[PDB]
Amino acid sequence: MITSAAGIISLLDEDEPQLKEFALHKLNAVVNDFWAEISESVDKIEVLYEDEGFRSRQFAALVASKVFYHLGAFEESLNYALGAGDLFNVNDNSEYVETIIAKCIDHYTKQCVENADLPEGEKKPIDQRLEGIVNKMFQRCLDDHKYKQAIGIALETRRLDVFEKTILESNDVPGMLAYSLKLCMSL
C-alpha cells in the first residue's frame, strides 16, 4: 500500500512494540516494493535484534536478512537468516526463499569442504537448526530422489552417514553404484 511513507520508520523507532508488530507485518508487504525505505531503519532493527527484550527474533531476522541481500552482501543476510532461530516456512516458488536457501546450501557445503581436510582439532561449531533446514529440503528432494542429484548432493555435503539412507530405497542398485563411482572419479 504505502511507498514513500516514513511513518513506519518512526513506528520502528518507537517503544511499546505491541503496536510495532502489525506495523512490521504490514512492512513485510511493501518490503518487496521498496527495500530502500528500510535502509535507515536497519540499524534500529539490528539494535532490537541484539537484546532479548523483544519476544520474536525471527520477525526482525527475516526483515534484516531480506533487506541485507537487497543492500549489502549475502553473508550478512545469511548470518541473521541462520541466526533466526526457530522458523516455520512452507515451500514457495518465490525468489527470496530459493535464493536464501541457495546461499545457505552453497555456504554449507563450502564449510563442509573447509572442514573436509581437517578431520580432527579446531572443529568449527555447527548449529542443529542449520542441519535441520538443510536436511528438510534434502529429504524433500530425496523422496523419489529423481534418480539424479541424490548421490550428487550426498557426495557434495561430505558427510559420512548421509548416503546410507539414500541407497535404502532405489531402483537398479548396481547402476546407482556405478553411476555413483562414475560421478566420484570425475571430481
Binding site: 557426495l155 553411476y179 560421478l183
Partner: protein
C-alpha cells in the same frame, strides 16, 4: 547426468584456469627471448666493413 554435469565441468574449469599462469609465463618470457635474439642478430652487424656497389 544432469547434476553430474556440474561436477564433471569443474575439472574443465580448473583445467582452463591453470592455463592462465602458463600463458603469462610464455608471453613474459618469449618477449625477453625475442629481444635477446634481436640483440643477438643486432650485434652481428659491425661498423667496420667493405663497401661494394
Amino acid at each position: 547426468d544432469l547434476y553430474s554435469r556440474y561436477k564433471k565441468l569443474q575439472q574443465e574449469l580448473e583445467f582452463l584456469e591453470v592455463q592462465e599462469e602458463y600463458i603469462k609465463d610464455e608471453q613474459k618470457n618469449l618477449k625477453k627471448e625475442f629481444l635477446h635474439a634481436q640483440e643477438e642478430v643486432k650485434r652481428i652487424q659491425s661498423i667496420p666493413l667493405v663497401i661494394g656497389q
